[PDB]
Design a protein around this ligand. Sequence first.
Ligand SMILES: CCCCCCCCCCCCCCCCCCCC(=O)O[C@H](COC(=O)CCCCCCCCCCCCCC)COP(=O)(O)OCCN
Ligand SMILES: CCCCCCCCCCCCCCCCCCCC(=O)O[C@H](COC(=O)CCCCCCCCCCCCCC)COP(=O)(O)OCCN
Ligand SMILES: CCCCCCCCCCCC(=O)SCCNC(=O)CCNC(=O)[C@H](O)C(C)(C)COP(=O)(O)O
Lengths: 107, 85, 546, 64, 50, 82, 56, 88, 45, 117, 125, 30
Amino acid sequence: EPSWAKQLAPKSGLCPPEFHYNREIWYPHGGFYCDPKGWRKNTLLTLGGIGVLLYMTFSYSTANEVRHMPPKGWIPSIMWNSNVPDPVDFRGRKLNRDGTLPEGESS
Amino acid sequence: ADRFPPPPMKATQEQMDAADVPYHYRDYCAHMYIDYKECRLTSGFSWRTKCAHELHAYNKCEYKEFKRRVAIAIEEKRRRGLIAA
Amino acid sequence: MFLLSVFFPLLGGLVNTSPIARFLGHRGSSIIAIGCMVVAFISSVVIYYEVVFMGCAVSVDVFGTWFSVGTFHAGWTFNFDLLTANMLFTVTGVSMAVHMYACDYMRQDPHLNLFLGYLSYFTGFMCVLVAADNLLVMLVGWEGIGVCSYLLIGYWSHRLSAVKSAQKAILVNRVSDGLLMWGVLWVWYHLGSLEYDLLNVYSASGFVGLSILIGAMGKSAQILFHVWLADAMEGPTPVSALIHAATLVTAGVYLLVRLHIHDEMFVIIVGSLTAFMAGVFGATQSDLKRVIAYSTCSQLGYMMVSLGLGETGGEASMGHLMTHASFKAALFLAAGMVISGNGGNQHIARYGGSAHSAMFTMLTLMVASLSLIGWPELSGFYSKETILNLAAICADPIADVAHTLLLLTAMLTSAYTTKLFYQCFMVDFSGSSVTPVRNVLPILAMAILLLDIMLKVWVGTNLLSGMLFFLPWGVKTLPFGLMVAGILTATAAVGSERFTLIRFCGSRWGFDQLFARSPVNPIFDLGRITWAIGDRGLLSVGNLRA
Amino acid sequence: TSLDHVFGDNSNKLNYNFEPMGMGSLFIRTMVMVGVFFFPVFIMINDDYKYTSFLDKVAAAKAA
Amino acid sequence: MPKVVGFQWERYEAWRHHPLLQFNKRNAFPGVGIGFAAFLAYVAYDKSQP
Amino acid sequence: ANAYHRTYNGKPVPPELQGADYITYAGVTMKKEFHLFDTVLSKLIGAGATFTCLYHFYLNAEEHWHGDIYFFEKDVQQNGWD
Amino acid sequence: VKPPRVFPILGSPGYQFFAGLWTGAMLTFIFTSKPLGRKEVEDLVKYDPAYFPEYA
Amino acid sequence: GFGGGFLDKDSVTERVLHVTKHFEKIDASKVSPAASFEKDLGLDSLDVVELVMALEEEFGLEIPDAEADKIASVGDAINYICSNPMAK
Amino acid sequence: GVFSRYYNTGLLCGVAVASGISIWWYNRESIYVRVKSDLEKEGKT
Amino acid sequence: MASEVVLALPHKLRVMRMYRTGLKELINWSANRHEWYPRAYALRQEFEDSKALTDREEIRKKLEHGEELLARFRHWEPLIKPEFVGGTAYSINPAQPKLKFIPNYDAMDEYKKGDHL
Amino acid sequence: GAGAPVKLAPRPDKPLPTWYELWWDNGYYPGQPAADFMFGAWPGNMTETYYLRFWSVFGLALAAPFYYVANFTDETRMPMVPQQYPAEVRDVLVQRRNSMLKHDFSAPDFKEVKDRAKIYWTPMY
Amino acid sequence: YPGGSFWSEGTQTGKNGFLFGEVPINGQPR
Ligand SMILES: CCCCCCCCCCCCCCCCCCCC(=O)O[C@H](COC(=O)CCCCCCCCCCCCCC)COP(=O)(O)OCCN
Ligand SMILES: CCCCCCCCCCCCCCCCCCCC(=O)O[C@H](COC(=O)CCCCCCCCCCCCCC)COP(=O)(O)OCCN
Ligand SMILES: CCCCCCCCCCCC(=O)SCCNC(=O)CCNC(=O)[C@H](O)C(C)(C)COP(=O)(O)O
């Protein structure tokens, strides 16, 4: 056996035992049946970083959304965005921010 | 189309702009279209039962226009001699 | 929520292909891919309810200007309007179930996370395509899904036929990409802008609609461009489901519906000829995936004719696209489960019985097949009958022949889909491998698409559902009789003795064989002339011996 | 040769001489290809001819 | 009138007609009875009497 | 593994594959097995699809027996025009 | 050729005759149903005294 | 499992002896390993063609035609199948 | 597939039957007249 | 007509290949295996009606006509088991051959790792 | 099942043809032509003459009905006129060459609208 | 799955290939 072969990872438990795949090659995506030992912790940390990216792009999207027409009723973006205009319904009547007809024609 | 003239429009331009009626739906049944769109887009899953009247009235108006279109075609072909009178 | 429908599948692809995936492995990458699709689907649901129902379009300046030289101005800008919300809901919802299926279907593949990253990239470039507000960011999406289609079709690269199928898809689509680019040049030159909202054309110079139609015929696999679509079955089953449902083949139809600058004669003739051709092609195949591929080509022909009919026809075309994606993806996933239950065999002569598949796979194939053949009050019934009735009242005399071609196509479709069910389950067993799949992830993947099939019946795509175009009972209920005729013929399993017609149709009219020598071999020979006779010959200057 | 009894041997050879196509076949197929893939050129040439013949008719019947 | 000549194929492959290898008609339409009963209950609840 | 066991050469069936749970026919033995998750999900989704079909057919039955023309013409003649 | 063992009615002569009967009828309805429908649509209004009292 | 991709000799022998006995003219007691198809068993060439096609069906193989021409006895078939890595 | 003469005979019988049905469809009353007579029939119940 | 390989065969093996290819083409043209069984019986009865012939001219005429029939009815989409040549599962994920490795190549003979001039 | 056996393709042991780059040898058996069906036997033993001969009838069998209806049938076959609009709505709708409202033979400017729907290709100057 | 479940430990420790073909000599920094 070569000197450097002791430094290499074994074939994982996902890989069939009769499959040969030249363990010295560094694949940028992981390679043949990649199964690292601390994978659950790494999965949790990458999920946390993805959540950070999710918050960042949610904030950027909310800051840069432009609505040239008022909506025709209540939309869920009213809850988190203050640039959403007041709804104007299908008959042209101005509405409240919770999507109900104002007093004078309600009930 | 003089023998079967069009009915008056009951929806103004401002009313069709307020309902955002598509420009190829702005015909002589546009008010019924406005009622049907307003009912259906706010009724969710159960639109077929609680907007049945608005859809039925819109289709009835389109039936009247369909009959007028058939009558216009019959009169035009009669004037051209294609159908004997 | 609006940018989360576009960025975030691209983020999932970036995670699963980078060296981050060296720390996650197969097990962690499957979790990352499924979560990164669930978030994008939730965002698309919010976008759909805001834009389709409450009518409030949203425009986002994302990354500033891309390039701006002279009056040619391309910006990194999105716009989320009715068509964009429709497409985003459809693409993300189908791609979520396909990811959930692929995390179990490709479990024994050695490079699973690479495959999942390619699927996510393909989905993200489709989202970029439909979210763009101008033509150049659309071209980013167009060529991005082309490249990812190449990477996914030729995934099993040690097989030469898969590599050649991927190269063929690239080259056939490159012809139409060239014509689409020249059409973009025409549009910008004679209207002054690239944004969709400033492209309102009443009367243009003919080359515009023709070249944009050719560019759309490439991606939507119409007549004389369909040749790459059947060979794209070399890729794995999730690739085929995502190609034939939500990505790639629906992009040209989306582009024509969005622009509405075509000339209707070409569109109607191309669409109806494509529908009849793919109907007779799929009636004479025995490969289980090739029949479904040809049914996809046939339905794209239906949508092409519909957008030829008019603005209402364009809406009906988008509606049939939206309802087609769900049952087509369901059909491919059920076929993949049947193939895996029968030891990898794809020939329908080696199936039979109810032992090689789960109960849910058979139910999925049955329900998606019933939606495809236009069984009454299912999802495909509404959209297909709308297109057929709109074609029966068009005042163009060309649409008279197109309607007849569509009715013949409807009978052929109900024939070969019933044949697909009959051979798979009803006949006696004629395989030798029974390994039925009953894992949770592919069953839930199929159940989601069946839920979307129910949703399309309960909540329509647009306002056309329930509108009555006034036709007699004879014209109206004829497609039901054509469906019944296809079912009765296919269950009777009858055949004709005209073997030369059978082998002309089963060999798919010889399009590939005729293309192998009408442009291809001449291109090779003209290259031989330009090199040997020109560079080494006529233009070569020799030495002076002394 | 350890798999020749499983997948077939190398005895059967490819029947192709690797020779160029015939001259007439190449010429005819190239002319068809030029007509199909360069149809805007013929469309625009026909437009120029139909336009200049109308101006010929105008200049003929105008000066009479 | 001889037809049993040359490798009896029906006897060799008579296991193809195993009852667990055939099409099962008991679960050919799963849930259709439940959906039909729910539809009948809805019709009696909503349209016939009220 | 494979879902059926084969016998060959008139051999006896192995004793683990006999009883009230197994079916042998012409030398091939298969197992009667009940799967719960598959059955429940298939029955639930199938009942949903059956109700979705039947309810919408019931809502449109009169427009499907007659056509559009007859149904709306009877509606005009019986229940007025405007 | 024998029918499948759980569906022997599909190989019956009556079933094959009925499938041929329905298929041929639908195939010729495809070609005949368009002008007959157009004549029905025209005759809806042509015989209406509210539109054309000359044709009764 | 067992074997480097190859089935064992005994189960292959049992399956080949099972396939071989499906003729009307065959006496079952004469069917043994290393028994000739024509001289010992009394099968013609068409019977041998059918037997090799049935063995293709039994072991899930696409036997090449030159190899199927060489099979002339029970032992030849057993030795061929035990040299297939694709024999299931 | 199955080469059936009953199916082939049924094809021509169906062509003939639907030709007769098309002839009956051509000589039918107007939908206005049919609806009016149907409503008159219902009004005597 | 047969190919140049089949025309080189002995007469017994030529007839055997003709019967074998006829059975396989009957598989390819049939809907199922249960459709195929009586067609296989009929093809066997067809070969049994020429077994007791002796005239080599009549044998040659029948052989050549049957080979023309088999060249006519060659199916455009043959049924191949997936893991064999022409199948759908052939040559997908083969085991890698042994590839050699060079450790620390950049560290061997540094300062002299370009191209000569 | 990864790791299935596959047969290797032999290396050339004879002089090569001049135009050898029309064979695709990827390392495994069998290789293929650079484009399929460019040489070698076609599937089903069909030939180019077969397809061209069947197409010389089948192409006119498909182009026949479109020509007949485009040259021997017109707008008056319909039992009704197109959808009617007010003048302010109609006047922009029929500006599209794409529109199906130009087939309204009861319109007072039917001819002029049809004369404006002629497709041009080179924009004139 | 190793361990009998999807949620078990991984089964690989050490270098999963050598980046740029660089192998550590005696544990020294590169
Ligand atoms: C080999 C091929 C690989 C393909 C890769 C995927 C396909 C990519 C296709 C498109 C690539 C475009 C990338 C552009 C990069 C930045 C360009 C803009 C530079 C800049 O300064 O702009 C500001 C940066 O903002 C921001 O960047 C936002 C601020 C930070 C909040 C969100 C963080 C990003 C989260 C993304 C998650 C993963 C997404 C993956 C694409 C935005 O402002 P402006 O000056 O333009 O002003 C106008 C609006 N205000
Ligand atoms: C519509 C028509 C349009 C026409 C457009 C034409 C465009 C021009 C095309 C060609 C332009 C480039 C010209 C030079 C090409 C040289 C090609 C390679 C020559 C070469 O390898 O050089 C030496 C051999 O040739 C030599 O010795 C070459 C000597 C230089 C060649 C030109 C000068 C010739 C003499 C000048 C007078 C000509 C007569 C004027 C009426 C090598 O030699 P070595 O060192 O290996 O061997 C020494 C032992 N002896
Ligand atoms: C799609 C369908 C296509 C049709 C395919 C062609 C069907 C035509 C079949 C009829 C044509 C013939 O019989 S071809 C002529 C075949 N007859 C002979 O050759 C004479 C007998 N001579 C012998 O040597 C042997 O008996 C021999 C039988 C060769 C070997 O059997 P054994 O070694 O045991 O002895």
